[PDB]
Design an enzyme around this catalytic site. Sequence first.
Site, short mmCIF file in Angstrom:
data_model
loop_
_atom_site.label_atom_id
_atom_site.label_comp_id
_atom_site.label_asym_id
_atom_site.label_seq_id
_atom_site.Cartn_x
_atom_site.Cartn_y
_atom_site.Cartn_z
N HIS A 187 -1.75 15.46 -5.50
CA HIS A 187 -2.68 14.80 -6.29
C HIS A 187 -3.05 15.31 -7.52
O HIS A 187 -4.16 15.82 -7.96
CB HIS A 187 -3.93 14.66 -5.38
N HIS A 221 0.79 11.82 -10.26
CA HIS A 221 0.52 10.66 -9.22
C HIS A 221 -0.07 9.62 -9.87
O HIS A 221 0.19 8.59 -9.57
CB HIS A 221 -0.06 11.41 -8.21
N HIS A 241 -8.45 6.51 -10.41
CA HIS A 241 -8.71 6.60 -8.95
C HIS A 241 -8.36 7.58 -8.15
O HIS A 241 -8.86 7.78 -6.82
CB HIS A 241 -7.65 5.48 -8.32
N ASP A 242 -8.05 8.84 -8.66
CA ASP A 242 -7.94 9.96 -7.89
C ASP A 242 -8.46 11.36 -8.68
O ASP A 242 -8.17 12.39 -8.26
CB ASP A 242 -6.48 10.28 -7.35
N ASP A 284 -0.74 2.58 -5.10
CA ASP A 284 -1.16 3.75 -4.63
C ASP A 284 -0.09 4.56 -3.59
O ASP A 284 0.14 5.57 -3.49
CB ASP A 284 -2.53 3.74 -4.05
MG LIG Z 1 -7.17 8.44 -3.34
ZN LIG Z 2 -3.64 8.03 -5.25
#
Ligand SMILES: [Mg+2]
Ligand SMILES: [Zn+2]
Length: 338
Positions: free
Chosen positions: A75, A79, A115-116, A245
Amino acid sequence: DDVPPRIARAMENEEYWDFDIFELEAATHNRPLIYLGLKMFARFGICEFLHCSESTLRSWLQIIEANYHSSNPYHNSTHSADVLHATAYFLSKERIKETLDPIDEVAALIAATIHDVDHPGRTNSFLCNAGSELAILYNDTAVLESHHAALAFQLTTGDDKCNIFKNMERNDYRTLRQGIIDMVLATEMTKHFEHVNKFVNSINKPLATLEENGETDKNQEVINTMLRTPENRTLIKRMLIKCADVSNPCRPLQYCIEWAARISEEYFSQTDEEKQQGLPVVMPVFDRNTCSIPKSQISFIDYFITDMFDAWDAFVDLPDLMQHLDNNFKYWKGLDEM
Ligand SMILES: [Mg+2]
Ligand SMILES: [Zn+2]
């Protein structure tokens, strides 16, 4: 504009599914998100939509990428650059182009990017069992996803030169903000089957029922009309970001293997820390001292990937992804060698 040659080259064929995301990572020295983000956003003409300067966009991408932890095996900003790439690939499909509106496209590309953000390389379950600050802040509910969305908006609107939403009309912005938030929250895995089943029940089944009446011009409008409701566009967007994702298993074998190595190490670290602190082990099977990465990938693919991509493919037509998924599944199966 004037991007160093090596980086310009690494970004040459970004519209193709087979893309060397790791060469982008290396060439950019762990800053793939600002470079891929700039080219993608331009290709989609996003600032020309949000009325922002390339300067404001650059600052925004910089602060977002800066908040992705490079120390995380999986992450990190690579990614997200990868998920951003898969998202653009999906938005570029006819079915999606003729179903979603430009504002949905904007929400999707931005959601992928953020998103992360600030992910700590630990699952929600870990943060909860540890009584982590974020878990306490979000009442053990969708902890990381809530944090990714919230932090992203805080960083964006907290500084004028980063706020890519500055020149928007309150209404349009409100609609875009809700759309971005929804997609980010939709990435929480506990709700995986809920989102997939709703997509199948409200999109694939009804659509298959209509595609029987034939290719009537009057039939097409019925389909176009049905798939464009705000409700269905939302379900399609949720499916789109979810598939982007977890699209690693649908990538060229070399990349698929690298992603498996990265997520595995991230999970192994968590397991080592849980047993250390004495915290309950949420992923008993993901221990570096007993886990088979190939068998684990096979289980993962059989449990989540197969049915979700089956449905996404059925709706969008993604032969390249499905062929890679089969090849990769066979590769993992072929490693038993015992
Ligand atoms: Mg996530
Ligand atoms: Zn992700």
